[PDB]
């Protein structure tokens, strides 16, 4: 199967504001299987940060936990990261995709979406 995503919402951000990404996906993957937000700081590779599942239920890294909120819609095929408390740290950009994409040959990550956070 092919699976085609597109990620919007970021921009510049003063530290301590916040922002909502979100993560158009096609076919039916959002309801299918589980969905996760990455981001990949400069120098770094992607890091999964927040996970959404089947049951809605979520997962955060440890550093997110508090300030990203991940949620979902199957019927609008879109999942969503509310970013708040924003740090320099979370300056980078944020892609959505399976969190089990490295089993399908077809390794498709967007173009993703860039955040940076100025300092007041
Ligand atoms: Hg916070």
């Known amino acids: 199967m092919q699976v085609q995503l597109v990620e919007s919402g970021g921009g510049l951000v003063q530290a301590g504001g916040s922002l909502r990404l979100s993560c158009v996906v096609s076919?039916?993957?959002?309801?299918?299987?589980?969905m996760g937000w990455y981001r990949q700081a400069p120098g770094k590779q992607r890091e999964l940060v927040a996970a959404?599942?089947?049951?809605?239920?979520?997962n955060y890294v440890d550093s997110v936990k508090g300030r990203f909120t991940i949620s979902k819609d199957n019927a609008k095929k879109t999942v969503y990261l509310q970013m708040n408390c924003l740090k320099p740290e979370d300056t980078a950009d944020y892609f959505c995709?399976?969190?089990?994409?490295?089993?399908?040959?077809?390794?498709?990550w967007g173009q993703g979406t860039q955040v940076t956070v100025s300092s007041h």
């Open positions: 076919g039916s993957a959002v309801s299918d299987y589980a």
């Open positions: 959404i599942y089947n049951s809605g239920r979520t």
């Open positions: 995709n399976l969190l089990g994409a490295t089993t399908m040959s077809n390794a498709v």
